[PDB]
Design a protein around this ligand. Structure first.
Ligand SMILES: Nc1ncnc2c1ncn2[C@@H]1O[C@H](COP(=O)(O)OP(=O)(O)OP(O)(O)=S)[C@@H](O)[C@H]1O
Lengths: 54, 70, 97, 54, 378, 51, 144, 139, 40
């Protein structure tokens, strides 16, 4: 419901936040390959910003 | 005669630069301030492959260099 | 170039090189991937359809940086995550001059 | 506080067992299990099984 | 077009050697034979199968269609020497000559391969031709024509480091090593199981998994065995798919000394009716037997048949005769007693196995050089 | 000193190599000790930025 | 047997020729090694087949069949121009087709190393044709 | 007879040796060397030399008057001293450099990393580079 | 030549040694398992 709202615009640093928390919660709710893929989307998301300083 | 010697120095450098064995571990590091006055016969795949530049720093790098040196 | 070179009785053939398309980048990727240590179940068309019409030189860069990303993990095979991060790296380098 | 203590308890236990077994054996070869059962502070069933596994 | 070509030789093995198993094989052998326009490779099996009551027209119309398809290319050659490409004649009818050779016998192979081999300067086509040789020499089990260009291909491989031909020939030499009694090589060649493309010879990746477990349960004892097939994951998911594969693994690693011959009964009865194990399944069984008996007898020295009858199975006399033959076979040194009910072990077996293999290879090498040195000077 | 060139006259090559000898052996790997260097000229505009 | 540009053994006192020496220099090949283009072939240009057909019809067709052109009676062609974005196969196609049609690939762009290998560096650039008459099936290729 | 003849051959070196470099060889018992006197010679060789020890490019001992191949040298001929040998380290540590993470990491993977993990490149199929070039403004 | 005067007339072998062990007794030994699991 929200990634469609986010990738329609330009912003990228918030995709980091939502994909990161989804990589937390699928590990929490015991879905290991989906947590892997949701982490991988964040891995390739984080290599597109000049300043992700934290 | 001043340029012929530098010329054959470059020739010998290229010729022993090319065929080591493709297995002899000898890494060659070169560095100049000027990356414009280079005959591109060096800068070919096989001889000098990776290109690295050292640009001027920026705000975060200024902070880090300050924190280190000071 | 010169208009005096462009006399029609001077050059015989003039040959265009378009930037590569989806199938063209797919062929380029299936050539340059043939030297790595890949893994089954990899989708190359996703990788080709994440490129913004890259050059014929840059896909080789994607393969080499995929090799580097597999190397830093102390791994011996190359999976699609390394390719996607290599796509991110090359598309970050695309804004360098 | 660890998310998985199965790894840490069970597998570090699966190490620390033979980390004790190198202690209890290094003195002497012809060793009886019924007196080493007290030094290991454990029943001898999993001693026989785990040491056969060793 | 030799990709579906392996099921042919599969059924060639599967039909004739079991006597009662001779109906479904000849059914879908017909279903594969009267299409693809197959003519040559089945005259022996035609003398092994039935009369095929009308051989008169039903196959001669097929070979006439083959003649049309053949000399349309042999009258395309003059149309392709009009514009000499990369010898478009030979580049066209190389794979179509292997179509003709999928029809034909190995003479079309031995001339068309070496014909089109010296055409190209791009070695990928050479690699494809070498694949063609390896496959058809595997079809006629010509285990000597293929070992030439295994080496001649690894020369064409190892100008550096690649993906394609390295992993492909890993699969190819793995099948050749599992063809002969070579098991640690089969495990080392089947080590990969990661980038082994869903192929025509890998007609199921799952069958590739079954083979690489059916030789890795022999090859090494335990100093990578748990780490590959137990601590691994990419193999673990697909062995988690089939029950029977995971069955014997967790059996033998669990040491369930009675379900072993159940698992081995299923795997062995499939091993009977499976190709490239035909001189192999007999030594396989005693190999598994001694490999289980090793890890049994290693832990205990005060053991007997009174421990066998309840944790291993029944027929104490069968235990007796089996261990008697296997111990007196110079294998698994441990000494057994009569009615005092004692099976004692020899605690190191590393005195004469030290001395053993050197004399056992020097025997064959000296016997070689005897005759071969007396070959010269008449 | 000079500044730099597109290699106009062949004599300027040797001056540039001499200046790079200076630039190397004032920084190098074997660092100097106590060698204070006084440098004077009219117009430092014509000097090499590497110096 | 006294070829031009061949090493001979010379005795020292009388200066007499002693023996012809092998391992000739191959200056064109040395220049080629100095240049060191990527050596390519057909199978690594996948995705540009129409341009392949064009260069076939304009280069492979004069070499293998001059008399098709001389029967149809037009000028056999002599010039190819390649354009596109930089980095889309401008080199591998030329080098590869020149490799398959068996022509001595020559890339003289701008060095003076090259100007020493060709001639003595004296006056002009046309001496590449003097070295191209000796290896007559050859192709000359250039950058921007 | 033969062994004393072998050692009577061996009077050739003894203390006037001059150093050429091996260039080429015609065939068995005939080679080509170019001296450090600038010129280049067609010489004969001794039957003493084990022929494994030659034919890339080796500093080789020549006779003065006869100017012929005599002996092989061990690898030598200074690399401006040689390889700094004990203590000529610049004494600069890792954390002394501040904030150069991409560049330090890249120079690491280009130089320091293939120095050790050589066999990973042969398995992954990376073709690690031969030479690396740095540049930038002065300072 | 070599007329050899006539008044008179792995893959195969190591597992034939092993097959000489296998020959007379228990040829297709797979069922005798299931034969004797219920005997005793
Ligand atoms: N058809 C192709 N498919 C895939 N990669 C290619 C292809 N052609 C070239 N490359 C790669 O792209 C690089 C650059 O292509 P080139 O053929 O050298 O064109 P180019 O030299 O970039 O043209 P320039 O820069 O204007 S001289 C080559 O070094 C190859 O690695």
């Amino acid at each position: 419901q929200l990634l469609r709202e986010l990738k329609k615009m330009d912003d990228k640093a918030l995709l980091v936040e939502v994909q990161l928390l989804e990589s937390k919660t699928y590990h929490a709710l015991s879905n290991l390959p989906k947590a892997r893929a949701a982490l991988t989307s964040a891995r390739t998301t984080a290599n597109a910003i000049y300043c992700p300083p934290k | 005669g001043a340029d012929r010697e530098v010329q054959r120095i470059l020739l010998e450098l290229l010729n022993q630069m090319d065929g080591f064995d493709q297995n002899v571990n000898v890494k060659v590091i070169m560095a100049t301030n000027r990356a414009d006055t280079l005959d591109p016969a060096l800068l070919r795949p096989g001889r000098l492959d990776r290109k690295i530049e050292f640009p001027l720093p920026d705000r975060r790098q200024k902070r880090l260099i300050f924190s280190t040196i000071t | 170039l010169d208009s005096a070179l462009l006399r029609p009785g001077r050059i015989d053939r003039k040959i265009e090189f378009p930037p590569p398309n989806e199938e063209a980048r797919l062929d380029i990727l299936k050539i340059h991937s043939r030297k790595m240590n890949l893994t089954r179940g990899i989708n190359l068309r996703k990788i080709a359809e994440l490129m913004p019409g890259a050059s014929g030189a840059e896909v080789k860069g994607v393969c080499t940086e995929a090799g580097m990303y597999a190397l830093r993990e102390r791994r011996v095979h190359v999976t699609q995550e390394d390719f996607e991060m290599a796509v991110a790296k090359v598309m970050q380098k695309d804004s360098e001059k | 506080d660890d998310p998985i203590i199965s790894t840490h308890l069970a597998k570090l236990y699966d190490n620390l067992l033979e980390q004790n077994l190198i202690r209890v054996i290094e003195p002497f070869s012809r060793v009886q299990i019924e007196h080493i059962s007290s030094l290991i502070k454990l029943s001898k069933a999993d001693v026989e099984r785990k040491l056969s596994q060793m | 077009p030799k990709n579906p070509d392996l099921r042919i030789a599969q059924l060639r093995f599967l039909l004739s050697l079991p006597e009662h198993r001779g109906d479904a094989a000849v059914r879908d052998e017909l279903m594969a034979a009267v299409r693809d326009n197959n003519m040559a490779p089945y005259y022996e099996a035609l003398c092994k199968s039935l009369d095929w009551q009308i051989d008169v027209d039903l196959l001669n119309k097929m070979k006439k269609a083959n003649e049309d398809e053949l000399k349309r290319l042999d009258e395309e050659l003059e149309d392709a020497e009009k514009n000499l490409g990369e010898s478009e004649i030979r580049d066209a009818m190389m794979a179509k000559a292997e179509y003709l050779c999928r029809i034909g016998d190995k003479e079309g192979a031995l001339t068309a391969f070496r014909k089109t081999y010296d055409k190209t300067v791009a070695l990928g086509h050479r690699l494809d031709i070498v694949f063609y040789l390896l496959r058809i020499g595997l079809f006629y089990m010509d285990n000597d024509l293929i070992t030439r260009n295994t080496e001649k291909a690894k020369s064409l491989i190892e100008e550096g480091g690649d993906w394609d031909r390295r992993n492909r020939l890993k699969v190819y030499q793995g099948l050749y090593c599992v063809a002969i009694r070579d098991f640690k090589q089969a495990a080392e060649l089947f080590l990969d199981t990661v980038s082994t493309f869903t192929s025509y010879e890998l007609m199921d990746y799952k069958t590739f998994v079954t083979y690489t477990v059916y030789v890795s349960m022999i090859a090494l004892e335990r100093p990578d065995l748990r780490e590959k097939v137990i601590k691994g994951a990419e193999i673990l998911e697909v062995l988690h798919s089939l029950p029977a594969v995971r069955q014997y693994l967790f059996s033998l690693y669990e040491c369930r000394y009675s379900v072993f011959f159940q698992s081995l009964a299923v795997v062995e009865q499939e091993m009977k009716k499976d190709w490239l194990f035909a001189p192999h399944y007999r030594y396989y069984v005693r190999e598994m037997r001694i490999h289980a008996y090793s890890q049994l007898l290693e832990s205990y020295r005060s053991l007997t048949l009174g421990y066998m009858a309840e944790a291993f199975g029944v027929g104490v006399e069968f235990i007796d005769q089996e261990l008697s033959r296997f111990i007196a076979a110079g294998r698994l040194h441990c000494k057994i007693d009569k009615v005092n009910e004692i099976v004692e072990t020899n605690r190191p077996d590393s005195k004469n196995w030290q001395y053993q293999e050197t004399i056992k290879k020097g025997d064959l090498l000296l016997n070689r050089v005897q005759k071969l040195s007396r070959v010269i000077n008449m | 000193g000079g500044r730099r060139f597109s290699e106009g006259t062949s004599a300027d090559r040797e001056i540039q190599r001499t200046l790079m000898e200076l630039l190397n052996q004032m920084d190098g790997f074997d660092t100097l000790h106590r060698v204070k260097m006084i440098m004077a000229t009219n117009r430092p505009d014509t000097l090499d930025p590497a110096l | 047997d006294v070829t031009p540009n061949c090493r001979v053994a010379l005795r020292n006192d009388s200066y007499t020729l002693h023996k012809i020496l092998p391992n000739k220099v191959d200056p064109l090949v040395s220049l080629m090694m100095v240049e060191k283009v990527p050596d390519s072939t057909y199978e690594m240009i996948g995705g540009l087949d129409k341009q392949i057909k064009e260069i076939k019809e304009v280069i492979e067709l004069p070499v293998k069949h001059p008399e098709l052109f001389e029967a149809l009676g037009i000028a056999q062609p002599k010039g190819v121009l390649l354009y596109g974005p930089p980095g889309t196969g401008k080199t591998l196609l030329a080098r590869a087709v020149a490799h398959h049609t068996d022509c001595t690939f020559i890339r003289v762009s701008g060095s003076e190393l090259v100007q020493k290998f060709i001639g003595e560096g004296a006056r002009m650039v046309r001496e590449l044709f003097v070295m191209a008459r000796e290896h007559a099936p050859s192709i000359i290729f250039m950058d921007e | 007879e033969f062994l004393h003849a072998q050692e009577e051959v061996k009077r050739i070196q003894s203390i006037p040796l001059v150093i050429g470099q091996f260039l080429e060889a015609v065939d068995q018992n005939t080679a080509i060397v170019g001296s450090t006197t600038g010129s280049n010679y067609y010489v004969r060789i001794l039957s003493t030399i084990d022929r494994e020890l030659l034919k890339p490019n080796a500093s080789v001992a020549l006779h003065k008057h006869s100017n012929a191949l005599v002996d092989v040298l061990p690898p030598e001929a200074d690399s401006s001293i040689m390889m700094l040998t004990s203590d000529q380290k610049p004494d600069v540590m890792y954390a002394d450099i501040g904030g150069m993470d991409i560049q330090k990491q890249e120079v690491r993977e280009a130089v320091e990393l293939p120095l050790t993990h050589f066999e990973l490149y042969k398995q992954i199929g990376i073709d690690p580079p031969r030479g690396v070039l740095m540049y930038g403004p002065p300072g | 030549m070599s007329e050899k005067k006539q008044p008179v007339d792995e893959d195969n072998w190591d597992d034939d040694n092993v097959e000489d062990d296998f020959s007379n007794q228990l040829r297709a030994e797979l069922e005798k398992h299931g034969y004797k699991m219920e005997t005793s």
